[PDB]
């Protein structure tokens, strides 16, 4: 059996793919799988057969995942594939997983790999939610012919529930406390399954059985290992990959509001704060400083779950993440005082947290003067650091941050500059919403009839700010408004040119090499041009938000500046208000579901439906 | 409630008690003053009333309560000695 | 062919790692961006209409 398996698998996989009838290839694979499963499921079957068969099945499933995705008068592509056949193969796979005692861990590892692949077969290719996808009114999302992928996901969840809590409990325990490889693969399997799980049965089983609390508690058993990885020569990289799979699983459950709530009730922020590994910033195999950056990326990445459908109900989460920032104020300041894309994304998420979390309304209720003074000193540090970001991003240092990466400006570099711009935006817009909230909630100190204006470096104990910074920000944002708008129009033109390429262009790009295959050449070119569509639509959303923010900020600023005695616009207004509105005008959108339509709770719900139609 | 939060809240209450004591709030009654000194964690008054804490371990636990509520398992030996 | 076998196993592990990385990072940042824009949009819109 060893020999047979090895031979067949190796040949099929390595042989140059001259398999003309890929349909017949798939049929052969299916037949083989079925035969193997039928033979091994016997009660009297030998245990030696198990391991060989399991590996062979895993290999075949990987082949099917590669083959089915390659496969994905118009009824000849899926005809011989078989959805009920996927279900029968899935049922045999699951049964063969159950029949495996704990002794054959490697068999269950290979089968969890096979199941991960069979799941990614049915994953819809992630389509970028371009600005244009908000034009499909909810009615066209409700009255369109069903997506077979979703029906298959529903059937797969019903099957997963058929084996009940037994299969889920077993795989969950083996993911929690197995071995190096098995833990990684099973954790990733949990990630994928809870990604597809809409009724959230798997997550409820994870919470009620206490497996989630184990996964979170296991993060504490890392302070001793990770401190050893900051030695230039780490012994093994497997722990890193298990940690990455674990943080991936934790990030997947955080996207769901109920998952974030159950993660807060488990005190994930509590355990994350007690970690000392975030404070060991190395002084400037991956590099040790890169290793600490990585260790930082999961932590803050998950901690920013609160930004998800964790609504104002998850406001205590603001206090928890504030405490997480404060318990490591040294590293936080060393980061905010350090020009990279990673650093800019860190600053963006950090300022988002600070804006949503550092409300003085949290202060007076934490008094159940020590904490008040602590968090006031923290707010002061934040106000001084977010003001120091205008002289780095709003002065002549802008061209030096944009030209030093011009030594190597590929598509990677172009997207990196787009991300630098979104970081500038994100951090400023978030702090500007924070200042607008501090001005609205306080009604900006009407008692400031006390003269606001006079009648004319490491973070120290105390340092005073300026207000001409507001005027400098005004001028710099007025100029960056023009620059970002012009860059936006050019990007839109580039997108229109990419669109003008029809299948006639597929024939015109294949006409030069027809006597990488030209068909797969256009496959890869569609990959590259769709990445271009992604980048360009991201830039569109960015520049639209840029214009909106600059506009509202300066509008209120000049509204205020009017009374206080202060002693190319027509083209930019033309490109923003008229152009983008009427162009992006599904404004006053769908009125069919709303035509078919207990008041207060539902009206706040259809407004939540109106936001989804925007997104 | 995280360990850091708990510790800082405890420290503020300790400061409150200290302030009260420095103001001679309980000067009239020696007993209340002694109780507040115990709240602060003064080991002198703790040892004066060792009749109540008949054993050494009781003394240790009282000290931990009024000095280091957040005590690591590793530090237990030193404090015990 | 032990070489071939090991190589193929390694290739299959790499595949699943790419998957987790792609799902999570993409989801998180995109999610944050969308949430921000949607929230700001309706907030500035309802504020401007009410402050008139």
**By the CB < 8 Å criterion, does B2 face chain A?**
yes
Whether A129 and C41 lie within 8 Å, measured CB to CB: no
From CA A362, how far away is CA A323, in angstroms rounded? 12
Residue A540's nearest CA partner among A587, A496, A492, A579 is A492
From CA A352, how far away is CA A134, in angstroms rounded? 25
Phi, psi angles (nearest 5°) of residue B35: -60, -40
From CA A545, how far away is CA A551, in angstroms rounded? 10
What's the token pair of residue A265? 């009730």
**By the CB < 8 Å criterion, does C27 face chain A?**
yes
From CA A554, how far away is CA A574, in angstroms rounded? 18
> Which candidate from A323, A371, A374 shows the least CB-CB separation from B2?
A323
**DSSP state for residue B81 in the 8-state scheme:** -
Whether A274 and B11 lie within 8 Å, measured CB to CB: no
Phi, psi angles (nearest 5°) of residue C45: -75, -45
Q: How close are the terminal C-alpha atoms of chain B, in Å? A: 31
Q: Spell out where chain A is interrupted, by the residue before each break (C to N > 2.5 A).
A: 72, 284, 338, 368, 456, 515, 567, 597
Residue A172's nearest CA partner among A197, A190, A194 is A190
Those chains having 3 or more beta-carbon pairs within 8 angstroms of chain C are A
What's the token pair of residue A2? 């060893």
**By the CB < 8 Å criterion, does A89 face chain C?**
no
**By the CB < 8 Å criterion, does B4 face chain A?**
yes
At how many Å resolution was this determined? 3.7
Instruction: Using DSSP, state whether C7 is helix, strand or coil.
Output: helix
H helix intervals, B1-81: 3-22, 30-40, 43-48, 56-67, 76-80
* Contact yes or no for A122/A149 (Cβ under 8 A): yes
Instruction: Using DSSP, state whether A181 is helix, strand or coil.
Output: helix
Whether A129 and C12 lie within 8 Å, measured CB to CB: no
Q: Using CA coordinates, name the residue in chain A closest to B14.
A: A370
**What is the rounded radius of gyration, in angstroms, for the C-alpha atoms of chain A?**
28
What's the token pair of residue A305? 């779950």
**Tokens 């401007």 belong to residue:** C48
**By the CB < 8 Å criterion, does A222 face chain B?**
no
From CA A261, how far away is CA A314, in angstroms rounded? 7
> Which candidate from A113, A245, A615 shows the least CB-CB separation from C34?
A615
* Contact yes or no for A118/A59 (Cβ under 8 A): no
Which of C20, C32, C51 would you mutate first to test chain A, the one with the most A CBs within 10 A?
A: C20
Residue A535's nearest CA partner among A493, A491, A580 is A491
From CA A271, how far away is CA A265, in angstroms rounded? 12
Determination technique for this PDB entry? cryo-EM
A189 Cβ contact partners less than 8 Å away, ≥ 6 residues apart: A112, A115, A116, A171, A175
Q: How far is B39 from chain A (nearest CA, A)?
A: 19
* Contact yes or no for A389/A510 (Cβ under 8 A): no
Whether A188 and C20 lie within 8 Å, measured CB to CB: yes
> Which candidate from A252, A304, A615 shows the least CB-CB separation from C24?
A252
Residue A162's nearest CA partner among A69, A85, A98, A258 is A98
For residue B12, the chain A residues in CB contact (below 8 A) are 369-371
Calculate the CA A466 to chain-centre distance: 37
Instruction: Using DSSP, state whether A212 is helix, strand or coil.
Output: helix
**DSSP state for residue A129 in the 8-state scheme:** -
From CA A328, how far away is CA B17, in angstroms rounded? 29
Helix axes A49-71, A22-40, angle to 10 degrees: 150
Contacts 24+ apart (CB under 8 A), B56-61: none
What's the token pair of residue A47? 């245990």
What's the token pair of residue A205? 């089983």
* Contact yes or no for B30/B24 (Cβ under 8 A): no
Those chains having 3 or more beta-carbon pairs within 8 angstroms of chain A are B, C
What's the token pair of residue A437? 């909230």
From CA A436, how far away is CA A444, in angstroms rounded? 9
What's the token pair of residue A259? 């998952």
**DSSP state for residue A314 in the 8-state scheme:** T
Instruction: Using DSSP, state whether C17 is helix, strand or coil.
Output: helix
Whether A195 and C23 lie within 8 Å, measured CB to CB: yes
Biggest alpha carbon distance in chain C?
77
Q: How far is A321 from chain B (nearest CA, A)?
A: 11
H helix intervals, A123-200: 138-142, 148-162, 164-177, 180-196
Whether A274 and B2 lie within 8 Å, measured CB to CB: yes
> Which candidate from C21, C35, C37 shows the least CB-CB separation from A545?
C37
Q: Using CA coordinates, name the residue in chain A closest to C20.
A: A248
Contacts 24+ apart (CB under 8 A), A164-173: A165/A205, A165/A209, A166/A98, A167/A94, A167/A97, A167/A98, A168/A202, A168/A205, A169/A205, A169/A209, A169/A211, A170/A98, A171/A97, A171/A108, A171/A112, A172/A205, A172/A206, A172/A209, A172/A211, A173/A211
**By the CB < 8 Å criterion, does B70 face chain A?**
no
A218 Cβ contact partners less than 8 Å away, ≥ 6 residues apart: A176, A246
Q: How close are the terminal C-alpha atoms of chain A, in Å? A: 55
């Amino acid at each position: 059996l060893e020999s047979w398996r090895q031979l067949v698998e190796i040949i099929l996989t390595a042989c140059p793919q001259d398999l003309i009838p890929t349909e017949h290839r798939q049929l052969i694979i299916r037949d083989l799988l079925q035969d193997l499963h039928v033979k091994i499921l016997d009660d009297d079957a030998a245990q030696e057969l198990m391991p060989i068969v399991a590996g062979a099945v895993f290999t075949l499933t990987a082949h099917l995942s590669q083959s089915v995705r390659t496969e994905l008068n118009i009824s000849a592509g899926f005809a011989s594939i078989g959805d009920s056949s996927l279900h029968m193969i899935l049922r045999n796979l699951l049964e063969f997983i159950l029949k495996t005692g704990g002794g054959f861990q490697r068999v269950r590892a290979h089968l969890y790999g096979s199941l991960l692949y069979y799941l990614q077969i049915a994953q819809r290719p992630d389509e970028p939610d371009t600005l244009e996808s908000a034009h499909k009114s909810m009615w066209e999302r409700l009255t369109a012919p069903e997506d077979v992928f979703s029906k298959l996901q529903r059937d797969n969840l019903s099957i997963f529930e058929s084996y009940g809590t037994a299969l889920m409990e077993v795989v969950c325990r083996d993911a929690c406390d197995g071995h190096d490889i098995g833990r990684m693969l099973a954790l990733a399997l949990l990630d994928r399954i809870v990604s597809v799980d809409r009724q959230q049965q798997w997550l409820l089983y994870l919470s009620n059985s206490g497996y989630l609390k184990v996964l979170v508690d296991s993060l504490a058993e890392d302070d001793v290992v990770l401190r050893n990885l900051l030695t230039p020569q780490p012994p093994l990289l497997k722990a890193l990959y298990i940690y990455e799979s674990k943080m991936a699983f934790l990030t997947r459950v955080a996207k769901s509001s109920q998952g974030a709530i159950e993660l807060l009730r488990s005190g994930v922020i509590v355990r994350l704060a007690q970690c000392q590994v975030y404070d060991m910033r190395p002084e400037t195999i991956p590099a040790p400083v890169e290793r600490y950056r990585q260790i930082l990326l999961p932590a803050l990445q998950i901690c920013q779950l609160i930004l998800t459908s964790s609504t104002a109900q998850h406001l205590q989460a603001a206090g928890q993440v504030l405490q997480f920032l404060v318990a490591h104020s040294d590293t936080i300041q060393a980061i905010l005082r350090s020009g990279s894309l990673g650093s800019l994304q860190e600053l963006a998420l950090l300022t988002g947290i600070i804006s949503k979390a550092a409300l003085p309304g949290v202060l007076n209720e934490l008094d159940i003067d020590g904490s008040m003074m602590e968090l006031q000193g923290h707010i002061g540090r934040f106000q001084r650091q977010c003001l120091a970001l205008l002289n780095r991003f709003g002065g002549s240092d802008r061209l030096r941050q944009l030209s030093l990466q011009d030594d190597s400006s590929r598509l990677d570099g172009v997207s990196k500059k787009d991300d630098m711009e979104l970081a500038m935006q994100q951090i400023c817009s978030n702090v500007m919403e924070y200042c607008q909230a501090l001005m609205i909630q306080n009604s900006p100190s009407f008692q400031q009839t006390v003269c606001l204006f006079t009648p004319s470096s490491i973070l120290p104990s105390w340092r005073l700010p300026s207000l001409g910074v507001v005027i400098h920000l005004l001028k710099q944002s007025a100029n960056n408004f023009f620059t970002y708008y012009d860059i936006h129009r050019q990007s839109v033109g580039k997108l229109q040119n990419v669109e003008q390429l029809p299948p006639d262009e597929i024939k015109e790009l294949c006409q030069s090499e027809m006597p990488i295959s030209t068909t797969q050449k256009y496959g890869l070119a569609r990959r590259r041009l769709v990445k271009l569509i992604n980048s360009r639509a991201k830039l569109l959303s960015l520049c639209s938000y840029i214009i909106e923010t600059c506009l509202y900020i300066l509008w209120r600023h000049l509204e205020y500046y009017l009374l206080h005695c202060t002693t190319q616009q027509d083209v930019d207004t033309l490109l923003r208000e008229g152009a983008n509105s009427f162009g992006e005008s599904l404004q006053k959108r769908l009125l069919d579901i709303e035509s078919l339509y207990f008041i207060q709770a539902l009206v706040r719900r259809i407004r939540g439906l109106l936001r989804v139609s925007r997104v | 409630q995280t360990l850091t939060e708990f510790e800082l809240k405890w420290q503020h209450w300790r400061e409150e008690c200290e302030r009260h004591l420095q103001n001679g709030t309980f000067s009239s009654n020696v007993h209340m003053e002694a109780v507040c000194r115990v709240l602060l964690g003064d080991e002198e008054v703790l040892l004066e009333k060792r009749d109540l804490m008949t054993t050494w371990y009781h003394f240790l636990v009282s000290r931990l309560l009024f000095k280091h509520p957040t005590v690591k398992p590793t530090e237990l030996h030193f404090y015990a000695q | 062919f032990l070489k071939n076998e090991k190589d193929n196993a390694l290739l299959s592990a790499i595949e699943e790692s790419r998957k987790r990385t792609f799902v999570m990072a993409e989801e998180y940042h995109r999610e944050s961006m969308l949430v921000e824009w949607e929230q700001v949009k309706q907030r500035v819109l309802h504020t401007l209409l009410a402050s008139g």
